[PDB]
């Protein structure tokens, strides 16, 4: 009867086209502002002093870029970790010079993605679902907050944060290799196993369902039209695909349970990306990966090279060349 | 010893945020009755509007 | 300096295959409206 109850009834209605919910009250204003500023800053945005040395790095399309090289540049080294909104900038020209829109996009992104995650919970509550799709979405939220939030914190500047682009991503990955040795760190190892394993069990499960489909169509029409939507009959012989994989490797390595099978598809990647995103986090605070340089010696004591020493000389090439003007002192403490 | 404390209590403090997500998803749904799954006799989606 | 044959590569790489996929959808809906026999078959 009241105005608030007629507003709570609408905002929590599943009869809307897109469910809004109470998290959409701060998902939609956040992500539309992260979007509408991203499209403008990617297309039309002046160059940005990223190194704090007043050498402005172009990153937008109107200043001679493309899809690959164009990128929303991170904020300055001069700012660093300080909060830099528009009203604390004394003009928009001073805001866009010092890496303004990187903080406006990222902070409205991480609020909107952490609200998109809670929105996946909310609709599962109002639909009668068991709730935990949003726990599986915690794994890219852990990884998005690792390279945009946690790594600028432990390194003390948003300038070490990830550039919102495509070539800026590979500037981020290579400089992160030289300074932290991520490939030898066992948490990037535990998530390469998460996505190689994840793409394995995806294409391994998706093939054994498509292999054991039941005849419901003719050879002229499509294979997919043998599934009517909302039917109650099972659309594939699960005993058939169990007997196949029960002979392809051996018998006891096969899940006859389809529920425990469809749980292992959700376990393996998500645990692999939780562990990986806490690799960037523990390497944000300079707890680097393994270092086996000069580890094998002869009885005389001369250093015998290994593959890690060849990997070290690739890291030394990126270390002596990243931010080639920003350094003045012999050790990259930042 | 700073890098051991900032990388281990930080390490745990994300997984306990995941513990807030698991244990409250179950507890809110155990209070409502559907933590064991959807009822076959009464599905809530079928008693809704057309989908659009 | 960009290659001026790339405009012809991209804008025909968009339009010619994308206008192809539209045609397979329009004749799909015409056959469904063709059999249905009401107000649109003719």
């Amino acid at each position: 009867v009241s105005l608030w109850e007629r507003f709570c009834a609408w905002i929590t209605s599943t009869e809307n086209r897109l469910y809004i919910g109470w998290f959409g009250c701060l998902m939609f204003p956040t992500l539309l502002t992260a979007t509408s500023c991203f499209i403008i800053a990617f297309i039309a945005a002046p160059p940005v002093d990223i190194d704090g040395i007043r050498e402005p790095v172009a990153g937008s399309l109107l200043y001679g870029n493309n899809i690959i090289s164009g990128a929303v540049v991170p904020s300055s080294n001069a700012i660093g970790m300080h909060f830099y909104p528009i009203w604390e900038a004394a003009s928009i020209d001073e805001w866009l010079y010092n890496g303004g829109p990187y903080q406006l996009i990222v902070l409205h992104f991480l609020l909107g993605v952490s609200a998109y995650m809670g929105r996946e919970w909310e609709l599962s509550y109002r639909l009668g679902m068991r709730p935990w799709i949003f726990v599986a979405f915690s794994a890219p939220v852990a990884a998005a907050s690792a390279v945009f939030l946690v790594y600028p914190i432990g390194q003390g500047s948003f300038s070490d944060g990830m550039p919102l682009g495509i070539s800026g991503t590979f500037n981020f990955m290579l400089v992160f290799q030289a300074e932290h040795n991520i490939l030898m760190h066992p948490f990037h190892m535990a998530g390469v196993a998460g996505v190689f394993g994840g793409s394995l069990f995806s294409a391994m499960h998706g093939s054994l369902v498509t292999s054991s489909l039941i005849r419901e169509t003719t050879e002229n029409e499509s294979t997919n039209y043998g599934y009517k939507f909302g039917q109650e009959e099972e659309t594939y012989n699960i005993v058939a695909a169990h007997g196949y994989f029960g002979r392809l490797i051996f018998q006891y390595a096969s899940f006859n349970n389809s529920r425990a099978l469809h749980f292992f598809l959700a376990l393996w990647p998500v645990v692999g990306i939780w562990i990986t995103s806490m690799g960037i986090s523990t390497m944000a605070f300079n707890l680097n990966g393994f270092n086996f340089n000069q580890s094998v010696v002869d009885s005389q004591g001369r250093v015998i090279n290994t593959w890690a020493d060849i990997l070290n000389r690739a890291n030394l090439g990126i270390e002596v060349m990243h931010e080639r003007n920003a350094h003045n002192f012999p050790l990259d403490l930042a | 010893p700073r890098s051991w404390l900032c990388c281990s209590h930080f390490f745990l403090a994300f997984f306990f945020l995941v513990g807030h997500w698991w244990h409250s998803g179950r507890a809110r749904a155990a209070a409502a009755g559907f933590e064991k799954g959807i009822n076959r006799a009464n599905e809530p989606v079928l008693s809704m509007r057309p989908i659009d | 300096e960009v290659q001026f044959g790339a405009y012809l590569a991209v804008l025909l790489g968009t339009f010619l295959p994308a206008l192809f996929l539209v045609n397979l959808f329009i004749q799909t809906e015409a056959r469904k409206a063709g059999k249905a026999g009401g107000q649109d078959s003719d």
């Binding site: 086209r17 297309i43 399309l61 109107l62 001679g64 870029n65 493309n66 899809i67 939507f229 909302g230 | 057309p50 989908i51 659009d52 | 960009v2 405009y7 991209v10 804008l11 968009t14």
Partner: peptide
């Protein structure tokens, strides 16, 4: 002149995302 093509590809991609969400073929039981 060159960046005009890149912008048209990007907003043209966001058009077909708009039509796929709102003008989707709504699936129906029976």
């Amino acid at each position: 002149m060159e960046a005009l093509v890149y912008t048209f590809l990007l907003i043209g991609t966001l058009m077909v995302i708009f039509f796929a969400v709102f003008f989707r073929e709504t699936p129906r039981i029976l």
